[PDB]
Amino acid sequence: EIEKLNNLQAVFTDLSSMDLIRPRVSLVCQIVRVGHMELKEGKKHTCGLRRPFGVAVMDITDIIHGKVDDEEKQHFIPFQQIAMETYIRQRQLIMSPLITSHVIGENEPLTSVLNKVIAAKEVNHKGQGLWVSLKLLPGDLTQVQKNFSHLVDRSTAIARKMGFPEIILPGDVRNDIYVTLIHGEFDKGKKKTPKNVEVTMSVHDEEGKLLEKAIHPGAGYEGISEYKSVVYYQVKQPCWYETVKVSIAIEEVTRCHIRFTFRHRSSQETRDKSERAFGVAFVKLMNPDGTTLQDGRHDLVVYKGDNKKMEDAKFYLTLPGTKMEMEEKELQASKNLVTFTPSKDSTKDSFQIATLICSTKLTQNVDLLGLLNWRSNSQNIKHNLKKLMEVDGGEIVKFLQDTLDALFNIMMEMSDSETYDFLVFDALVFIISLIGDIKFQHFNPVLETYIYKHFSATLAYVKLSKVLNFYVANADDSSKTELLFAALKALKYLFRFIIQSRVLYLRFYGQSKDGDEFNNSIRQLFLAFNMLMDRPLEEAVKIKGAALK
């Protein structure tokens, strides 16, 4: 790109405070040649295929530390090419030739070369490299682009951090589906040479229509309909580890899946284009339980067989896509011998991917969804309430509004069962405790917003007062001790919600017929506190401290 050389400016935002204190931070440039499989002259070869070339790494940890900052500095990052050492040293070997090997100078993954460049501080770059000016600019994208508009303009390329920040601003709408093709074991088949497998991912809807520009190779580049993995020269297990960007509409990912096409890339363009994808794997970005694809590693299944079927959305989508899907279909097929015959097409070929989804609306939890599905999951409400605490505050905070609303619905509908009331009490306590954290304190304004505007309960305040009065009545209980202490920690917002419910009652029924009763509840909380406190301090000194606090 002739218009990018003078504007090849790379900015890496989201670098939180812990990002800086990382002991070892390295800016790694992947040098991959796009073009011919073989650097040979005389015959046509497949063009546009990606091959590993080398890795350039510079330890920029102290550069990100802010120790050194100067625009005019042009840090020459040494480039380390892969060891294609097969020409010089072979010229001197006489009087004892006993060697039977092959040429492996390009087949190594760039992961191994990168590991070597990390291990070897000095790179024998031999004058091959790249000059970059490295600086850290305080603040976010806006602050960097306004306090350093000269360095960083709106045309400057933008790159985000592989994860989440230490401060989650309310409304950080993102859909970062980072896909990393870790590795894949592909059988050589009838071919003596191992297939030059190239993972050409294809994002299709549930109807199979390929989503255009869904896959993004990386920062500073537009999306593409399909992204091709680095074609490895005759490798049985090509290890890619290629992290790519996927930005689907967060509403559309509910009906979108990435289909992974693996084609044998022969050394000849005619054979390359006459060879179809011998196997295709695929992953649905939504779990069967209504949640999106989980954050972690998913092992895809390379399917073999009729080319139409292995590309038929109405068929291969119905086919399990992962080894987890393999085993779940197999096990759920064991309890019912009703039309469950394993297909012999399930070859040993497998594919591995890493899906770091950095999103705001995407949901990854069974317990959270089921508890949000309380009106149809009444049987697991007792379990979903128990297991919502293990659901991370990050999962909760995305739809804390809906979680609160559903809890209040559970309370108003079935408050008769006090055990579920206790479960919702404790879930709410954990909720406020986690929101009060530094990570989630920024949604405390959102929490108050929900309290003051979106709150929709009219009698739960009674029940919560009852439950907390029971806690303070049973203060000496060791199991309760932590529960009541946590209730102490979040008393403020607890009674914010309680007062909201009470006032909603007030304005919905005109006058408080039980205002006397409610005030008596307040007074009895006072005096139950008094029994709590007049007990010997040795049992609950920290509890009395939190009470005073």
Indicate the angle between helix axes 491-508 and 478-489, nearest 10 degrees: 70
Amino acid at the residue 475: A
Amino acid at 192: K
DSSP state of 210: B
3-state secondary structure of 165: coil
Contacts of 93 (CB under 8 A, 6+ apart): none
For the residues of 432-455, what is the DSSP string, one character each? HHHHTSTTTGGGHHHHHHIIIII-
The values of phi and psi at residue 198, to 5°, are -125, 120
Q: How many CA atoms lie within 13 A of 56 on its CB side?
A: 16
Look up residue 369 and give its two tokens.
Answer: 């969804």
213: tokens are 């520009």
Distance, CA of 34 to CA of 280 (rounded, Å): 23
Distance in angstroms (rounded) separating the CA atoms of residues 133 and 39: 33
Check: CB of residue 424 under 8 Å from CB of residue 404: no
Strand partners, 264: 197
Give Rg (Cα) of the chain.
30
* 297, 456, 462 from 453: Cα distances, Å: 40, 9, 20
Q: Which residues have a Cβ under 8 Å from the Cβ of 95 and sit 6 or more positions away?
A: none
| Residue type for position 271 | R
Q: In 3D, which of 455, 482, 460 has the Cα closest to residue 400?
A: 455
Give the separation between CA 234 and CA 218, rounded to whole angstroms. Answer: 26
3-state secondary structure labels for all residues of 286-336? ECCCCCECCCEEEEEECECCCCCHHHCHHHHCCCCCEHHHHHHHHHHCCCC
Six token digits for residue 287: 């779990």
Separation CA 279–CA 222 (nearest Å):
27
Sign, CA dihedral 316-317-320-321, equals positive
Contact present, 205 and 258 (Cβ < 8 Å): no
C-alpha–C-alpha distance, residues 174 and 163, integer Å:
11
Cα separation, 175 vs 223, whole angstroms: 14
CB-facing half-sphere around the CA of 263: CA atoms within 13 A: 23
Query: Going by C-beta distance under 8 Å and a sequence separation of 6 or more, which residues neighbour residue 8?
Result: 157
* CA 26 – CA 500 distance, rounded (Å): 51
Q: After which residues is the chain broken (C to N over 2.5 A)?
A: none
Indicate the length of the chain as a whole number: 549
Distances (CA, A) of 62 to 8, 24, 59, 151, 443: 22, 9, 8, 20, 33
Residue 260 pairs in a beta bridge with 201, 281
Beta bridge partners of 131: 76
Q: Is residue 258 within 8 Å of 246, Cβ to Cβ? A: yes
Q: What is the resolution of this structure in A?
A: 4.2
Q: How many Å apart are CA 47 and CA 44, to the nearest integer?
A: 9
Q: Which two tokens stand for residue 322?
A: 């992962």
CA distance readout (Å), 137 to 12, 14, 28, 213 = 10, 11, 20, 31
Cβ neighbourhood burial of 353 (10 Å; 0-12, 13-18, 19+) = buried
Solving technique for this entry?
cryo-EM
- Give the whole-angstrom CA distance, residue 442 versus residue 436: 9
Amino acid (one-letter) located at 446: V
Q: How far apart are CA 479 and CA 190, in angstroms?
A: 66
How far, in Å, are 83, 248, 427, 442, 446 from residue 170 at the CA level? 49, 21, 22, 7, 7
How much helix, strand and coil, in percent to the nearest 5, is found in the chain?
35, 20, 45
Decide: 19 and 57 in contact? Cβ < 8 Å: no
Dihedral, 66, 71, 74, 77 alpha carbons, nearest 10: 30
What CA dihedral angle connects 438, 440, 446 and 452, to 10 degrees?
A: -80
Measured distance CA(224)–CA(212) in Å, rounded = 6
- Nearest by Cα to 63 from 117, 12, 128: 12
Cα–Cα distance for residue pair 523/307, rounded to 1 Å: 76
Q: What type of residue sits at position 345?
A: D
**CA–CA distance, 449 with 436 (Å, rounded to integer):** 15
Angle between helices 478-489 and 537-548 (to 10 degrees): 20
State phi, psi for 317 to the nearest 5 degrees. -60, -40
What distance in Å separates the CA atoms of residue 33 and residue 50, rounded to the nearest whole number? 5
